Amino acid sequence: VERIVSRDIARGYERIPIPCVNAVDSEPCPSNYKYVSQNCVTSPMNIDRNITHLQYCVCIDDCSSSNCMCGQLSMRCWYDKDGRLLPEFNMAEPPLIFECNHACSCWRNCRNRVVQNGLRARLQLYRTRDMGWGVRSLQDIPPGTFVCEYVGELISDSEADVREEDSYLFDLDNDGEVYCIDARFYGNVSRFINHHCEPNLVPVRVFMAHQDLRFPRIAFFSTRLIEAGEQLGFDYGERFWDIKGKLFSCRCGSPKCRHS
Ligand SMILES: C[S@@+](CC[C@H](N)C(=O)[O-])C[C@H]1O[C@@H](n2cnc3c(N)ncnc32)[C@H](O)[C@@H]1O
Ligand SMILES: [Cl-]
Ligand SMILES: [Zn+2]
Ligand SMILES: [Zn+2]
Ligand SMILES: [Zn+2]
Numbered sequence: 291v292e293r294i295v296s297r298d299i300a301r302g303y304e305r306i307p308i309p310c311v312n313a314v315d316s317e318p319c320p321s322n323y324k325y326v327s328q329n330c331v332t333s334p335m336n337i338d339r340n341i342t343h344l345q346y347c348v349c350i351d352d353c354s355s356s357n358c359m360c361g362q363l364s365m366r367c368w369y370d371k372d373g374r375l376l377p378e379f380n381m382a383e384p385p386l387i388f389e390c391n392h393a394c395s396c397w398r399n400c401r402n403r404v405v406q407n408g409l410r411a412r413l414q415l416y417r418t419r420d421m422g423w424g425v426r427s428l429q430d431i432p433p434g435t436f437v438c439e440y441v442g443e444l445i446s447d448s449e450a451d452v453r454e455e456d457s458y459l460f461d462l463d464n465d466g467e468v469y470c471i472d473a474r475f476y477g478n479v480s481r482f483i484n485h486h487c488e489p490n491l492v493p494v495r496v497f498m499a500h501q502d503l504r505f506p507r508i509a510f511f512s513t514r515l516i517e518a519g520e521q522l523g524f525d526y527g528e529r530f531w532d533i534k535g536k537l538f539s540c541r542c543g544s545p546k547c548r549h550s
């Protein structure tokens with residue numbers, strides 16, 4: 291029997307609820323963190339929010355032409371009219387995406403606005419058999435769809451170096467002054483996504499309200515059709531596994547598993 295242990299881990303902060311179920315053991319809904327739908331800070335990050343530092347477009351249409359500056363900053367606008375990545379998008383080595391912003395001349399419904407509209411997919415936190423909690427999709431997700439943002443506490447590399455728990459860390463830039471998102475204490479649904487060696491999600495660096503290149507936001511897009519019921523996964527990368535490989539091996543179960 292599948293016990294519903296929370297009707298919505300996000301407490302109404304997302305468009306739709308994200309329930310938590312457990313059909314495996316007696317663990318209640320995780321409660322040792324604070325759910326936040328948007329990134330936060332403790333110690334100040336001097337993110338450059340000078341509005342005059344934004345690059346922006348002057349389009350008079352819906353930003354579907356090659357003349358859109360924001361599309362040019364992105365190399366091209368990668369979004370179709372449904373907000374999905376074009377099949378040409380390089381999932382193995384994604385570009386930076388510059389969405390339209392409040393300095394642009396265009397309207398709030400232009401083509402180059404997806405991640406800034408937030409999470410839309412029906413997701414569920416659930417108890418896996420041997421990897422703790424995980425996240426699944428409740429409905430089919432077509433390829434190239436925005437699924438969720440990796441949300442947490444923005445911290446410096448120096449701060450990350452003095453934290454005990456590094457299992458909920460995302461590195462913003464792999465030399466010099468770099469930053470991390472730590473989802474341990476503050477995070478959204480993405481903090482529960484498990485690692486997979488052939489992942490159905492890819493992280494993409496995105497700029498929206500600011501273009502401080504030290505601080506990309508991390509948007510997971512589907513790399514293929516995700517069927518209703520499937521567990522979400524992304525590739526945690528080599529730093530994670532160099533460290534945690536000493537303690538445990540990857541249980542993703544892929545025939546192409548690289549960390550077993
Ligand atoms: C960010 S958390 C993911 C959510 C986690 N399962 C939980 O219950 O909180 C990362 C941790 O989950 C486990 N994990 C995630 N992916 C895994 C994998 N492919 N193989 C083994 N353990 C994994 C490891 O304990 C890892 O340090
Ligand atoms: Cl959208
Ligand atoms: Zn434009
Ligand atoms: Zn626009
Ligand atoms: Zn624009």
Ligand SMILES: [Zn+2]
Nearest residue numbers: 487540542547
């Ligand atoms: Zn694996």
